[PDB]
């Protein structure tokens, strides 16, 4: 781990994370929003 | 033959206007698009020919307002799971809900 990084990740883990994009509902927020702040998981998301 | 296309409304019912209620769950019905949802105003890009939307789920995505000049973004009303943290019935029961 390189503690100077945002997360205690090794030069190798940095690539294992930034080169992996996961698509998951609730981490992907709504477009147009329904209720709650865009922040955190304050804004409800349940895809369609 | 009901024209749901962009133009100001000329015909609606005898019932008294109620204006847009933002960030509350309402029953809406604008330009053919009805359902139960939370009204806000347009953040989405639109074409003038596509000022209303229904998505692949057969629910309202966006609609243009009959009285004002704004396009509304409508997102179906909030819901979420009830996850109860509870012990056995061999002990007094507790109820915390996520």
UniProtKB/Swiss-Prot annotation, chain B:
It comes from the Viruses. Disulfide bonds join 25-77. Glycans are attached at residue 90. Residues 6-28 are annotated as: Disordered. Attaches the virion to the cell membrane by interacting with host receptor, initiating the infection. The major receptor is host ACE2. When S2/S2' has been cleaved, binding to the receptor triggers direct fusion at the cell membrane. When S2/S2' has not been cleaved, binding to the receptor results in internalization of the virus by endocytosis using host TFRC and GRM2 and leading to fusion of the virion membrane with the host endosomal membrane. Alternatively, may use NRP1/NRP2 and integrin as entry receptors. Binds to host ACE2. RBD also interacts with the N-linked glycan on 'Asn-90' of ACE2. Cleavage of S generates a polybasic C-terminal sequence on S1 that binds to host Neuropilin-1 (NRP1) and Neuropilin-2 (NRP2) receptors. Interacts with host integrin alpha-5/beta-1 (ITGA5:ITGB1) and with ACE2 in complex with integrin alpha-5/beta-1 (ITGA5:ITGB1). May interact via cytoplasmic c-terminus with M protein. May interact (via N-terminus) with host bilirubin and biliverdin, thereby preventing antibody binding to the SARS-CoV-2 spike NTD via an allosteric mechanism. This is Spike protein S1. It comes from Severe acute respiratory syndrome coronavirus 2. The lineage of its organism: Viruses, Riboviria, Orthornavirae, Pisuviricota, Pisoniviricetes. The gene is S. The chain holds residues 514 to 611 of 1273 of the full protein.
């Amino acid at each position: 781990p390189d503690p100077s990084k945002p997360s205690k990740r090794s030069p190798i883990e940095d690539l294992l994370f930034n080169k992996v994009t996961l698509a998951d509902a609730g981490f992907i927020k709504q477009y147009g929003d329904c209720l709650g702040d865009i922040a955190a998981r304050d804004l409800i998301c349940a895809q369609k | 033959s009901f024209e749901l296309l962009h133009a100001p409304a000329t015909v609606c019912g005898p019932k008294k206007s109620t204006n847009l209620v933002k960030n509350k769950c309402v029953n809406f019905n604008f330009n053919g698009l009805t359902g139960t949802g939370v009204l806000t105003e347009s953040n989405k890009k639109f074409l003038p020919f596509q000022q209303f939307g229904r998505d692949i789920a057969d629910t309202t995505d966006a609609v243009r307002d009959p009285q004002t000049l704004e396009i509304l973004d409508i997102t179906p009303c909030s819901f979420g799971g009830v996850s109860v943290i509870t012990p056995g019935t061999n002990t007094s029961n507790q109820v915390a809900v996520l």
